[PDB]
């Protein structure tokens, strides 16, 4: 279960240097030890190592060994991973996990990159022409030209969570495009509004746009 | 590094159908202290990992007990005695025994389900890009089966196939289907300049490609 806070997305250059955190809010990690598990877009999970955060003692991986990190600070209930001399290779998603009821941290993407952060324009998609499907509405949302990953996309501030169809980032020129549509009775849409929640972590970019009625397209 | 092998790589189920997933170490996963350290991990696209089994058969909270593990020294096997929906996504088997803990390259489990025919959806580009000089043309293909799909754009009967960024969601935890989303992006002038605008899929589901036209100045 997703129990832990880790630190937003990292863009960092080639050859620097970073430091992932890993925290709780409802419980002292020193009591459980916490371990980091990586993984590069579209392949397995790889373990880094493990820490016993309340005296700092850690084994790392052979593959880490000197490339990685570990130290746990008990005073502000915080662990982490500090990562040198970065590569292509090392961009991927950074998981902590704690001894302690299979508790999870939600993932740090980290983009080793030397492009630039770009925060997104974000557009609503009000359908035409009066379309419906048996009696039903969908709505849309255009994430466009951000860089780089995550965007979280939510719908009525995540209340509307049912019949929503988040799709995966494309990248194209240094630039990603990501869209999401919400599926909605006709009775809702446009008598109750309809809000496309939009958050750029790296640039700390927040954006609301609310799906109007179009005017004559 | 004791190596962690999983048999399939792939797992295509009927809805309904008993599943296995096997996992074979590379050297023995009994420790001294008699226990086996072998768990098995689930993870749905895009989320963090969560855990099913523990000490090769203890089932987590929570986790059905359509799910079992059993095995000892170099072969493990997870059982799902019947699979649901919302069993899609990677399964891994993962071992603490030795140092460094290795993991399994994941089981990719799919279900098979019947036929589904997309729904199709076209949004003109909002004023707001068009303001901003852009404009994209937004085509979504909604809850179709199986995953391969094609489209094509044509504008004013012309197909165009510069511009267009397609992606794919994974199977539906619910449904089981999938959904696609193909934007062709222009400029406000090449956009203002034309009239038609059409997506257009070819599915296994029909003879002929289900088209949706959007025409300026109409609605």
Same mark, same amino acid.
């Given at each position: ?10 863009? %960092? ?5 970073? #430091? ?17 598990? #990586?993984? /590069? $877009? ?20 052979? /593959? &880490? ?14 662990? =982490? ?12 998603? =950074? =998981? ?23 925060? $997104? ?6 359908? %035409? ?16 030209? =951000? &860089? ?15 019949? %929503? ?18 599926? %909605? ?15 750029? $972590? ?11 009625? /179009?005017?004559?397209? | ?42 993870? *749905? ?5 969560? *855990? ?6 203890? *089932? ?52 098979? *389900? ?47 196939? @510069? ?31 034309? @009239? ?18 959007? @025409?300026? @100045?109409?609605?």
């Amino acid at each position: 279960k997703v129990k832990l806070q880790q630190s937003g997305a990292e863009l %960092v250059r080639s050859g620097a240097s970073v #430091k992932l955190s890993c925290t709780a809010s409802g419980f002292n990690i020193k009591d459980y030890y916490i371990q980091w598990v #990586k993984q /590069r $877009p579209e392949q397995g999970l790889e373990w880094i190592g493990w820490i016993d955060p309340e005296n700092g003692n850690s084994e790392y991986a052979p /593959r &880490f060994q000197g490339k990685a990190t570990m130290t746990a600070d008990t005073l502000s209930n915080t662990a =982490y991973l500090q990562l040198s001399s970065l590569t292509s290779e090392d961009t991927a998603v =950074y =998981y902590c996990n704690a001894d302690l009821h299979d508790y999870w941290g939600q993932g740090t993407t980290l983009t080793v990159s030397s492009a630039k952060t770009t925060a $997104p324009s974000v557009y609503p998609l009000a359908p %035409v022409c009066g379309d419906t499907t048996g009696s039903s509405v969908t709505l849309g949302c255009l994430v466009k030209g =951000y &860089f780089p990953e995550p965007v979280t996309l939510t719908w009525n501030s995540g209340s509307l969570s049912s019949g %929503v169809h988040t799709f995966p980032a494309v990248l194209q020129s240094d630039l990603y495009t990501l869209s999401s549509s919400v599926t %909605v009775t006709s009775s809702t849409w446009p008598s109750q509004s309809i809000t496309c929640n939009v958050a750029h $972590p790296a640039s700390s970019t927040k954006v609301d746009k609310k799906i109007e009625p /179009r005017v004559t397209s | 590094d004791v190596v962690m092998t999983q048999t399939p790589l792939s797992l295509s189920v009927t809805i309904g159908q008993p599943a296995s997933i096997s996992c074979k170490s590379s050297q023995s996963l009994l420790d001294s202290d008699g226990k086996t350290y072998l768990i098995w991990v689930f993870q *749905r696209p895009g989320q963090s990992p969560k *855990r099913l089994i523990f000490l090769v058969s203890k *089932r987590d909270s929570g986790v059905p007990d359509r799910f079992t593990g059993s095995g000892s020294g170099t072969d493990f096997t997870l059982k799902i005695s019947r699979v649901e929906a919302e069993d899609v996504g990677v399964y891994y088997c993962w071992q603490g025994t030795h140092f460094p803990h290795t993991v399994g390259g994941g089981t990719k489990l799919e279900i098979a *389900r019947a036929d589904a025919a997309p729904t199709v959806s076209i949004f003109p580009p909002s004023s707001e890009q068009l303001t901003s000089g852009g404009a994209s043309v937004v085509c979504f293909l909604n809850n179709f089966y199986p995953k391969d799909i094609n489209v094509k754009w044509k504008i004013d009967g012309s197909e165009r196939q @510069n511009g267009v960024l397609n992606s794919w969601t994974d199977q539906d935890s619910k449904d089981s289907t999938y959904s696609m989303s193909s934007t062709l992006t222009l400029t406000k002038d090449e956009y203002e300049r034309h @009239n038609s605008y059409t997506c257009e899929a070819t599915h296994k589901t029909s003879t002929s490609p289900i088209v949706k036209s959007f @025409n300026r @100045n109409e609605c």
